[PDB]
Specification:
Chains A, B, C, D, E, F: It is found in: Cytoplasm; Lysosome; Cytoplasmic vesicle, Autophagosome. The structure is cut from a larger assembly and holds six copies of chain A. Chain A is mainly α. Chain A is built from five helices and no strands. Chain A has a single domain, classed as Ferritin (Up-down Bundle), CATH 1.20.1260.10. At the A-F interface, α1 and α2 of A face α1 and α2 of F. The complex binds sodium ion (NA) (28 copies) and zinc ion (68 copies). The site of one sodium ion has 3 residues of chain B, from α3.
Chain lengths: 172, 172, 172, 172, 172, 172
């Protein structure tokens, strides 16, 4: 047992390791999306920039969870980072919809983590999740939903002009 | 169902709409108080300034709740903003006591909202309430209680000199 | 009778109270419109910003009328602020058309107020209306008419691209 | 009953008074440690500085709890501040281990306080504890654990060179 | 015996430990007074500020005595810090009178300490007391006497207006 | 075939995808090492900082290879990022030796990549490897070899003082 460990349940430690893997996976998904839009036959530089920024953000989320794991005296156990579901993300609208799906999945995982911390009476972990992850997820989901709405209303994916102008005016 | 909606109960959405109305109502009450003290036969400019500032603050609280409602994918339903209970607020001390009563009512509504969010296992909403409303209410109630105490100790409302000097030295 | 009251007819005082309510109502309508465009399934941030600014402006108009009421020695009597006619404003073009209708209604009320002040030989009130409200209404109506014209010419509401680009280039 | 008191249980008020005493006690313990390292036969100035800073920090924690007690309308009841368990803290490593023990005791008290506030449905008090005390305790415990680990690995307390160099390089 | 000890009598060392406790006690008394005036039913913020400043000053006095004890090679022995005589200080005037009584008690203790240092032919300790404590006590006593005189002359404690205006104009 | 593809062999494209995976793997290894040294029972903050910096650098190397793949008209195919070989890196010296082994492995992969590009007569790819990767690997290997030499000469891993002072003076 770690000399710093106090009120930190083994179930919570395991769930934090699972969340670390999920954040690293999300980072990898966004990296794949970013370099899809960097292809010469897609060529939407601001979509590429948007998703690269998200990928770096998800890496930061993972590192904050690793820092928490050490702060509480749990032990980090890393796992394989699985490859993303797609190599070809088909369009800006499809990538935004996949990102929305992924962010809602990550949010569900975080809500389950909060439920576990509540059940184990770990208010520090509950506060950590609420303070650093829950509103970040709500904001990310709202932003992605807005992007999806605008792309659809503009005529994406059938209108390449729609994605070009969205790339310029919203993501630029 | 909104594409962004996740873990947002219909009861919580309804209670947020009720709180929006309550904040707009509080804004209206403070506006009435402010312009009562702007009357030529009352003529306490810093009481008027104090309550105008509170009115603008309550409008901001309402707008933050509307923003939350959209962030979570709920739908804003506005209602009539009822007129304040008084047209004549009788004195600075009476207006401060009415404001204290109103802030404790709003606080009770927020505590009921927090209880509902806890019962529906919505930690994001609980965190939103705690972070942006609960300590604001506690601070507002403590400030109003202090003002009431000082006005009473100075001899208000029978001493017009008391309210004049309080207007100058505490609210100025 | 107020010690400051001079040449201020009771009919004028009543009409000023009615105008105060109308300005607060207009503020509420614009607030509703603003947060309609903040929805994730509408997602036009600059429409939302435009109407929020108008809502704050209408609150300022109401407060200037309350200040006038006290300056002249009349007494403010507040009434319920009725809810806006719509919860769903359907599109940027429809909201702009409703705003144009509302501003022309407010202008008609102000012209009736000016007629009353003229009939009661209250040149200070006539000057107040002309100086602070009449050209503001004419400018607001012309601006809204311009917005409606451009949205229609661009193909709104059927073209979501039209409202997206109007949001970006005119309202942004 | 205080005019500001709302949703503040007498048990919570009593537990806050107990925590105030515990924070003042911790401040006294750290003060004793600091001036132990200021002795001419110990002479570790940066250990002395470290513990003096902690003592002032614990005084600040106590004052924030007193401020909370008044904000909620509870009444502060002070008790004797008991003397620290030791006059002679024997070594830098022993003092760091005693500080780690003390911080884990204070953390346990704060977790019991949070459990009580949760049981009494006082979300403002829960938020106060989480926001201002729980992560502070986790960070303090992790820091002390790190210091203990490094001192042990360097050969303290048998190596006076170890504590000298730790004083210079980590605490300086 | 400490390697630095020279011309430092054991009686002087004991009396310095007693003075350390007395200064810490005075700090605690002032802390209690400060947060009495922070209550919502007392609400005199500048009285609260005044006594908080005095409390921090008394902590500094205690720390300077601890530093002296180590400089001379004596050993600090801490004792319990007894709780203050009152929880409720009843009024600004009563608190100022209690503070005057406390400062005269501390001054008497310091004069006895000086007499002891003179009797033991310890000129360094005599100089320390004269330089850092005696005129500080005389100035504090004169200031408190002035405050008491002004509060009484203004009509305190029966006049709440008196304490309000003293809080504003003398302590603000 | 990509419209930009010229003199880019399918074997080279495959080897670039393999190198992308190897760089991401190296980033993950360094991340694991970094947070090993962040544990409370290891507590070497500058080792942790060193390896975190290396992890971010390896992510940058991977992204530059992905950028190259798109510049040449090849297609990125991502694979699973395998977990690092160790969860516990045992000591600063052992982690530095593992890092040296890993960097020499990555260097061997890059030399094989250069041999392939030479065999396929792809001077742009050869230049890319030489310019951005080969001297970076040589410098990294020399730096790690220096660190290993110094840690061994200082007495690591048996001397915890050795790793403490190396952490302070070389990595700090
Ligand atoms: Na996954
Ligand atoms: Na999903
Ligand atoms: Na989805
Ligand atoms: Na879900
Ligand atoms: Na109401
Ligand atoms: Na009058
Ligand atoms: Na109430
Ligand atoms: Na009340
Ligand atoms: Na209540
Ligand atoms: Na109306
Ligand atoms: Na939708
Ligand atoms: Na109209
Ligand atoms: Na119209
Ligand atoms: Na008309
Ligand atoms: Na204790
Ligand atoms: Na010695
Ligand atoms: Na403990
Ligand atoms: Na311990
Ligand atoms: Na415990
Ligand atoms: Na005493
Ligand atoms: Na005395
Ligand atoms: Na006295
Ligand atoms: Na005496
Ligand atoms: Na590998
Ligand atoms: Na350990
Ligand atoms: Na190797
Ligand atoms: Na090697
Ligand atoms: Na080799
Ligand atoms: Zn351990
Ligand atoms: Zn994330
Ligand atoms: Zn971060
Ligand atoms: Zn740890
Ligand atoms: Zn473990
Ligand atoms: Zn593992
Ligand atoms: Zn995927
Ligand atoms: Zn494609
Ligand atoms: Zn906890
Ligand atoms: Zn936390
Ligand atoms: Zn919807
Ligand atoms: Zn409010
Ligand atoms: Zn706000
Ligand atoms: Zn929405
Ligand atoms: Zn709904
Ligand atoms: Zn409605
Ligand atoms: Zn009312
Ligand atoms: Zn009146
Ligand atoms: Zn939630
Ligand atoms: Zn939240
Ligand atoms: Zn009047
Ligand atoms: Zn938004
Ligand atoms: Zn208007
Ligand atoms: Zn104005
Ligand atoms: Zn008036
Ligand atoms: Zn009237
Ligand atoms: Zn009315
Ligand atoms: Zn309407
Ligand atoms: Zn609609
Ligand atoms: Zn006139
Ligand atoms: Zn005029
Ligand atoms: Zn124009
Ligand atoms: Zn355009
Ligand atoms: Zn009370
Ligand atoms: Zn503390
Ligand atoms: Zn503080
Ligand atoms: Zn109080
Ligand atoms: Zn009480
Ligand atoms: Zn007591
Ligand atoms: Zn102790
Ligand atoms: Zn010792
Ligand atoms: Zn509460
Ligand atoms: Zn909570
Ligand atoms: Zn709180
Ligand atoms: Zn000694
Ligand atoms: Zn206060
Ligand atoms: Zn003193
Ligand atoms: Zn000092
Ligand atoms: Zn000494
Ligand atoms: Zn001694
Ligand atoms: Zn003792
Ligand atoms: Zn006392
Ligand atoms: Zn009292
Ligand atoms: Zn001497
Ligand atoms: Zn001296
Ligand atoms: Zn004087
Ligand atoms: Zn292609
Ligand atoms: Zn590399
Ligand atoms: Zn790069
Ligand atoms: Zn390409
Ligand atoms: Zn290909
Ligand atoms: Zn693949
Ligand atoms: Zn490995
Ligand atoms: Zn290990
Ligand atoms: Zn080439
Ligand atoms: Zn060459
Ligand atoms: Zn090249
Ligand atoms: Zn050294």
């Amino acid at each position: 047992t770690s000399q710093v460990r106090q009120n930190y349940h083994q179930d919570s430690e395991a769930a934090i390791n699972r969340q670390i893997n999920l954040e690293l996976y999300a980072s990898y998904v966004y990296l794949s999306m970013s370099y899809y839009f960097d292809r010469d036959d897609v060529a939407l530089k601001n979509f590429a920039k948007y998703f690269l920024h998200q990928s770096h953000e998800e890496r930061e989320h993972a590192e904050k969870l690793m820092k928490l794991q050490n702060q509480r005296g749990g032990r980090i156990f890393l796992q394989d980072i699985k490859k993303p579901d797609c190599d070809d993300w088909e369009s800006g609208l499809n990538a935004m919809e996949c990102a929305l799906h992924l962010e809602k999945n990550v949010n569900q995982s975080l809500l389950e983590l909060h439920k576990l911390a509540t059940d184990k009476n770990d208010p520090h972990l509950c506060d950590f999740i609420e303070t650093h992850y829950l509103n970040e997820q709500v904001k990310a989901i709202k932003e992605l939903g807005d992007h999806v709405t605008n792309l659809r209303k503009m005529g994406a994916p059938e209108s390449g002009l729609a994605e070009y102008l969205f790339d310029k005016h919203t993501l630029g």
